[PDB]
Amino acid sequence: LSRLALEADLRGAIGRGEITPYFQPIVRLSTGALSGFEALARWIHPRRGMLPPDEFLPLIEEMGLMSELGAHMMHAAAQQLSTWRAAHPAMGNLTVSVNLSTGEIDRPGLVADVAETLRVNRLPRGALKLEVTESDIMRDPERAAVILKTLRDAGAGLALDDFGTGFSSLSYLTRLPFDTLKIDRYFVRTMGNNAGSAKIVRSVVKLGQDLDLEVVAEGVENAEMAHALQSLGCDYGQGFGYAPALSPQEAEVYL
Amino acid sequence: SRLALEADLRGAIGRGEITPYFQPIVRLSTGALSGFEALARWIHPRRGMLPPDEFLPLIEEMGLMSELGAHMMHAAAQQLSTWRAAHPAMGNLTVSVNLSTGEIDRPGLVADVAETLRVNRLPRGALKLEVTESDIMRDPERAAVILKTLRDAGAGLALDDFGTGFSSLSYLTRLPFDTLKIDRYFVRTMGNNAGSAKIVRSVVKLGQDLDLEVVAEGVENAEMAHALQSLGCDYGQGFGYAPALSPQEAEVYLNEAYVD
Ligand SMILES: [Mg+2]
Ligand SMILES: [Mg+2]
Ligand SMILES: [Mg+2]
Ligand SMILES: [Mg+2]
Ligand SMILES: [Mg+2]
Ligand SMILES: [Mg+2]
């Protein structure tokens, strides 16, 4: 029924401004302070209401609009970040992250588009971060190494999302210019009653410290998980224990 | 000369021409001996000692890998029991043997290992099997089960050449290894290479936080040993201590190790 109607509605949705970022807070465990946001795509359909990425992203992909979606999300994330910095100069280097789907990292013109977005939004280096999964790196490690260095050289921060799943290669990591590792949600939420998950959480945290990478635990559901991560030296946390992806005006309240 | 060697390999394991030499593994802090890695050497009647890279490939072309693994394990196990009996005061003396790619999938491996422990009357963990990460990345869940059964039979388990390839943090947390070895290359070049320095440091901490004893391979001098122990690395092996020794030479090294 709808599987085909959505495609009709989805065409042009990006240009109409219907797919917009929502912002989930990332908090520094040591001080409790807001340190940045992860921007997450949301489709506010005029009829259907808000729809989550799992329901539209696959269709964006089939229609070949992934590149258009990524440019839009990055642009919207960056503009919001600059608008907040102009309204609250007290902040310094509050960051915003954007997720790239598999292969987006190789799209033609990505580096120029990022440089252009940091320029026009007058952002500091590292203010806008790109989150990728290891699929993009295992895919072709040497190529990933080239692309990632040029994105870092252009001013983008870089985060390795969902770390702990799949290979979680210690060797490949030491050669990639990441500045942030994110512990996947599953490990964080089962670390209290799953021995395997507890070992992955501790190792990732210690590994980040040994490699000078900042570590963000994803999926912090409550203050107890928060406190455990803090005791291990984990840098940041994000999850429903703090807040979901917020609309701009709700996110602005944290500033 | 390739097929000439191949002809010479027929029945060579049988005539006992391929035998183990033992390289010491030592505790870095106290400089004491903890064990040996058993390394195969072919003492050809005419050509003299031939290293594994020159015959190991031939052993596999002829499908003799299992016969070689069996012989090396038996020979290392017999030598270990003799040493342990002549050295009651070294409760932790172990010997290691290397399984080449695919050996852990052999049907009767666990039974063979179990028999070797029994006939040589070895305590649990005295005999270790060293496997590479590639031999495990082929089928992670299969290998996990097989490794667990080897642990349960009383064999020690070491993950050799760590640092190379994937060096998977996720898989290492789930596999029942007791020892992790850092590949020679990173230990050699950690002095002049930021990357190798990072691999060596983080493998040590990862290993230790997982309750694994870490062994640095390729310790070539007192400089590498001191830099490794100032990282808290457990053990080391390498030409800076001794190469793979003949059994008569290893016995002397063992005897001298009693002296502080
Ligand atoms: Mg993400
Ligand atoms: Mg994702
Ligand atoms: Mg994630
Ligand atoms: Mg070895
Ligand atoms: Mg080997
Ligand atoms: Mg090795």
* Angle in degrees, CA B183, B185, B191, rounded to 5: 120
- The tokens describing A161, both together, are 């999302």
Dihedral (Cα; A222, A227, A228, A232), 10-degree rounding: 140
Instruction: Specify whether the CB–CB gap between A7 and A45 falls below 8 A.
Output: no
- The tokens describing A145, both together, are 């190494």
Interface test with B, best of A162, A165, A170 (most B CBs within 10 A): A170
Nearest to B218 by CA among B238, B235, B236, B203: B238
- The tokens describing B63, both together, are 């499908």
A207/B206 Cβ within 8 A = yes
Please tell me chain B's helix, strand, coil percentages from 3-state DSSP, rounded to the nearest 5: 45, 20, 30
Distance of CA A87 to the CA centre of its chain: 23
What b/e readout covers A145-183, taking b as 16+ CB neighbours within 10 angstroms?
eebbeebbebbbbbbbbbbbbbbbbbbbbbbbebebbbb
Q: Dump strand ranges (E) for B28-155.
A: 33-44, 48-50, 94-98, 127-132
- Dihedrals φ, ψ of A91, to 5°? -65, -40
How far from A188 is each of A35, A183, B153, CA to CA, in Å? Answer: 20, 7, 34
Q: What is the CA radius of gyration of chain A?
A: 18
User: Which among A168, A171, A211 has the least Cβ separation from residue B170?
Assistant: A168
* Residues in chain A, total: 255
A171/B169 Cβ within 8 A = no
- The tokens describing B95, both together, are 């010997």
Instruction: Specify whether the CB–CB gap between B163 and B186 falls below 8 A.
Output: yes
**Ligand 5 geometric centre to CA of B53 (Å):** 10
Cα–Cα dist B126/B250, whole Å:
17
- The DSSP code for B165 is T
Collect residues with CB below 5 Å from ion ligand 1: A 99, 131, 161
Q: Experimental technique used? A: X-ray
What b/e readout covers A237-253, taking b as 16+ CB neighbours within 10 angstroms?
bbbebbbebbeeeebee
Say which ligand is closest to the CA of A218: 3
B202/A174 Cβ within 8 A = yes
Cα–Cα dist A243/B13, whole Å:
67
- The tokens describing B187, both together, are 């230990």
* Ordered DSSP codes for A195-249: HHHHHHHHHHHHHHHHHT-EEEEE---SHHHHHHHHHTT--EEESTTT--SB-HH
Domains of chain B: 1-260 (3.20.20.450)
How far from A135 is each of A52, A71, A166, A175, CA to CA, in Å? Answer: 22, 20, 9, 16
* Ordered DSSP codes for B224-251: HHHHHHTTT--EE-BTTTB-SB-HHHHH
Cα–Cα dist A88/A220, whole Å:
27
Q: Say if residue B249 carries a ligand binding annotation.
A: no
Chain B residue closest in CA terms to A209: B202
Nearest to B24 by CA among B259, B229, B255, B250: B250
Nearest to B49 by CA among B241, B219, B240, B244: B244
- Dihedrals φ, ψ of B208, to 5°? -60, -45
Nearest to B73 by CA among B22, B116, B21, B11: B116
Min CA distance, B198 vs chain A (Å)?
Answer: 7
What b/e readout covers A11-46, taking b as 16+ CB neighbours within 10 angstroms?
eebbeeebbbbbbbbbbbbeeeebbbbbbbbbbebe
Q: Dump strand ranges (E) for A80-223.
A: 95-99, 128-132, 157-163, 180-183, 214-218
Instruction: Specify whether the CB–CB gap between B231 and B7 falls below 8 A.
Output: no
Say which ligand is closest to the CA of B181: 6
Distance of CA A54 to the CA centre of its chain: 16
Binding site of A, by residue number, is 24, 38, 41-42, 99, 101, 131, 161-162, 185, 218, 221, 240
- Dihedrals φ, ψ of B214, to 5°? -105, 135
- The DSSP code for A165 is B
Cα–Cα dist A169/A248, whole Å:
36
User: Which among B163, B171, B174 has the least Cβ separation from residue A171?
Assistant: B163
End-to-end CA distance of chain A: 43
Q: Say if residue B100 carries a ligand binding annotation.
A: yes
User: Which among B169, B174, B209 has the least Cβ separation from residue A170?
Assistant: B169
Cα–Cα dist B201/B206, whole Å:
9
- The tokens describing A124, both together, are 């500091």
End-to-end CA distance of chain B: 48
Neighbours of A205 (CB within 10 A): 20
Instruction: Specify whether the CB–CB gap between A207 and B167 falls below 8 A.
Output: no
Q: Dump strand ranges (E) for chain B.
A: 18-27, 33-44, 48-50, 94-98, 127-132, 156-162, 179-182, 213-216, 235-236
Min CA distance, B177 vs chain A (Å)?
Answer: 14
User: Which among B164, B166, B173 has the least Cβ separation from residue A200?
Assistant: B173
Give the three-state DSSP class for B93: coil
Q: Say if residue B139 carries a ligand binding annotation.
A: no
What b/e readout covers B175-203, taking b as 16+ CB neighbours within 10 angstroms?
bebbbbbbbbbbbbbbeeeeebbbbbbbb
**Ligand 5 geometric centre to CA of B134 (Å):** 11
Distance of CA A211 to the CA centre of its chain: 20
A196/B174 Cβ within 8 A = yes
**Ligand 4 geometric centre to CA of B254 (Å):** 20
- The tokens describing B202, both together, are 């983080």
Cα–Cα dist B3/A98, whole Å:
60
How many interchain CB pairs under 8 A, A with B? Answer: 62
- The tokens describing B97, both together, are 């043997």
Instruction: Specify whether the CB–CB gap between B237 and B37 falls below 8 A.
Output: yes
Q: How many helices (H) and strands (E) does chain B have?
A: 11, 9
